[PDB]
Design a protein around this ligand. Structure first.
Ligand SMILES: Cc1c(Cl)cccc1NC(=O)[C@@H]1CCCO1
Length: 284
């Protein structure tokens, strides 16, 4: 049995190294990572890898790792794949814990835009979770938390995190993680996987995939949303991604909206994440 060294960036930024037989399917590595993390609610999570075009791909647990990573390194990230619309219903605190680590990265990276006040509030909950109750001994007027809270840090933001931290006295890590998630779940880009595309006129858009449906971001005005119940079916062919939308009652025929993706692999990738979200959130 020939075994391959696997490296996995965990959500705390640490690197986990393990081995799998070279012929292993993605599920084998995923199960090893989840056992290491003491994670039982595995369905929300997955491993990503970077293809030869440097695009993020989900490692398919059903297929050989080698037939996915192909010419690239056996280097992976552990990530939230399906963001729960209601994290309060997750059965385990440890699940909510990893969801918080993913969301913190979503915020710092800028993938999850956030108001000044909401950056401070989320930050205050993270601090309550990681440090416990406010202590003025590790917070002079000039205090600068080691915690990354935002894509751009200001002293005003650092001061607001501290002021809000003061109000959370007695709050346990589990409680602060729950408060974190009840706020984060309401942000407009929460759980939205964005894909660059052009519409049929060739205009640059973004297609969002999430629990509630598809979003077409033309700009900020007339965002255009298709709830899963409105979507009749989905397909790719070559560079193209097609969405069939139900007719209104007594409208006779479904409509087709077509998009141009950068390449065929981008079209398939989008198709696949749409199918996966549709199955997951039709059921959940
Ligand atoms: C996968 C899917 C999503 Cl994502 C959303 C709505 C419908 C479907 N189904 C299909 O596209 C086809 C046609 C019937 C069976 O599969």
């Amino acid at each position: 049995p020939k075994s391959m060294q696997c490296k996995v960036i965990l959500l705390d930024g640490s690197e986990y190294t393990c081995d799998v037989e070279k012929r292993s399917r993605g599920q084998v590595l995923f199960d090893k990572v989840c056992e290491h993390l003491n994670l039982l609610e595995k369905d929300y999570f997955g491993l990503t890898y970077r293809d030869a075009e440097n695009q993020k791909n989900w490692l398919d647990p059903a297929k050989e790792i080698k037939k996915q990573v192909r010419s690239g390194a056996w280097h992976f990230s552990f990530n939230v794949k399906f963001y729960p619309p209601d994290p309060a219903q997750l059965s385990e605190d440890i699940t909510r814990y990893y969801l918080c680590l993913q969301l913190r990265d979503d915020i710092v990276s800028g993938r999850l835009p956030c108001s000044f006040v909401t950056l401070a509030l989320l930050g205050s909950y993270t601090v309550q979770s990681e440090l416990g109750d406010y202590d003025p001994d590790e917070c002079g007027s000039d205090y600068i938390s080691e915690f990354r809270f935002a894509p751009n840090h200001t002293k005003e933001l650092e001061d607001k995190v501290i002021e809000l931290h003061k109000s959370h006295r007695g709050m346990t890590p589990a409680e602060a993680e729950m408060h974190f998630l009840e706020n984060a779940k309401k942000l407009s880009m929460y759980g939205v996987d964005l894909h660059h595309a052009k519409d049929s006129e060739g205009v640059e858009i973004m297609l969002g995939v999430c629990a509630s449906g598809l979003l077409i971001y033309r700009d900020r005005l007339r965002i255009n949303r298709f709830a899963w119940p409105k979507v009749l079916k989905i397909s790719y062919k070559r560079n193209n991604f097609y969405i069939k939308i139900r007719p209104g009652e007594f409208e006779q025929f479904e409509s087709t909206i077509g998009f141009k993706l950068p390449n065929h692999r981008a079209a398939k990738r989008l198709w696949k994440v749409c199918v996966e979200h549709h199955t997951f959130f039709r059921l959940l």
